[PDB]
Write a structure and sequence with these properties.
Blueprint (H helix, E strand, L loop, with lengths): L4 H4 L3 H9 L5 E4 L6 H15 L4 E4 L3 H14 L7 E4 L5 H10 L2 E4 L1 H9 L10 E5 L9 H12 L5 E5 L6 H10 L4 E4 L16 E6 L3 H24 L11 H15 L9 H20 L2 H16 L4 H7 L2 H16 L4 H16 L5 E4 L3 H13 L4 E4 L8 H11 L4 E4 L14 E4 L4 H10 L9 E7 L3 H8 L2
Helix pairs in contact: 2-3, 6-7, 9-11, 9-14, 10-11, 11-12, 11-13, 12-13, 12-14
Length: about 475
Amino acid sequence: MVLRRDLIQPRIYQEVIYAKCKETNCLIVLPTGLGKTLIAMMIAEYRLTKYGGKVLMLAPTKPLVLQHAESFRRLFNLPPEKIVALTGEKSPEERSKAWARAKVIVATPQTIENDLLAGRISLEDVSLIVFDEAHRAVGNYAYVFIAREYKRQAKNPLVIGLTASPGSTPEKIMEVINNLGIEHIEYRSENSPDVRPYVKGIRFEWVRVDLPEIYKEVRKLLREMLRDALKPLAETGLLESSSPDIPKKEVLRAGQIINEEMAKGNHDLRGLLLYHAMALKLHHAIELLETQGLSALRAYIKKLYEEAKAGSTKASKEIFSDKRMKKAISLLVQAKEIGLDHPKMDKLKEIIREQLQRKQNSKIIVFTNYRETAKKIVNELVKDGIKAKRFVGQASKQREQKLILDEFARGEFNVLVATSVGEEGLDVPEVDLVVFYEPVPSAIRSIQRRGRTGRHMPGRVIILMAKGTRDEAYYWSSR
């Protein structure tokens, strides 16, 4: 038994596909998590036992090359030194030395191209090439060249391209199909009768948090001011509408547009630069209010008040002379008076409470897009009677990661609060529940994918949303 099929329990669709693409240049299109690489290895085994003795898998990044290389070593019953990884960091000689004895080789297209031109290696004995992320086999990419070489100098050629999508454009698809000499495409959806039996229902529980009067009001005032700040920009045509709902990106555009016009020698739309600055500030204020809460807003309004007194920023001045900003500032104090910072925190505490109550042994993960929010959540939870610990990915304020993660696993603390980077915590056994402070794309994606594999999955997951705020829109927008 060359491939340890006994350890991977190939599924029906995996089997079927392997059988068809076994002797035809194919494109295997499956949503991530369904085993494309595994199917590849199944095919790789068929080639190594019937034809020559060289299988080559290419991958975009180096971490991907290493990863695949390891999986092959784990599932293949072949001498460990015959499974080589060419990241292109070895001595130009060793690479040729490795390629020499290798029976399976995983490398980046970059390096394989070089040594291919230089004449150090020849893909004539390669009974199979697998292009991971084959869709990037367009234009200039090293894939296209390698594909061409292989196509002409290979004894028994077989091209297998793996991808979650070959392209979005007919032209784009045609380019890769032709570049890789694709004779056939095997597609599958999470719903193919072929795959369904292997896909887990997820059930994300979307819970809508209502907004307390003060929060609601402060927000309305801030929005209304933003509207007025945008009206003039819109009436000029610098943006589609003066709606406080427009994307931040659209207002930044309105700004640089005015700049590129002064660089040309216009200077008419000069006065509008004032409103653009107020917009940016008001927009940021709303952003803090929604993303973090009243306290973050208060802090910013203050730091913004120093800019007004310093007499430097005309924008900051104008914003304070507005009766609305005034009433906002009064409510903002009225808030601290009752300890109101953000509705989600209250709801978060509540659900985490009832969870630890039904099982104080609970292991729960809280996700958030922002580090600041993560920090405020940890404190607010430890401030209550809860054992919470922050989990972020070293960039500003490494290995402790593994340490803390192990603690989470053993039962040290009950709550792991992390940003996108902490999605590896989902690989910890028996994690009872994860709750998204806001929807966090990468993590929601991770969970979605795990449902396709048999990897650890949370017992239940809750997504929180602020009634009538971007949160809601994102729920819908997502169909």
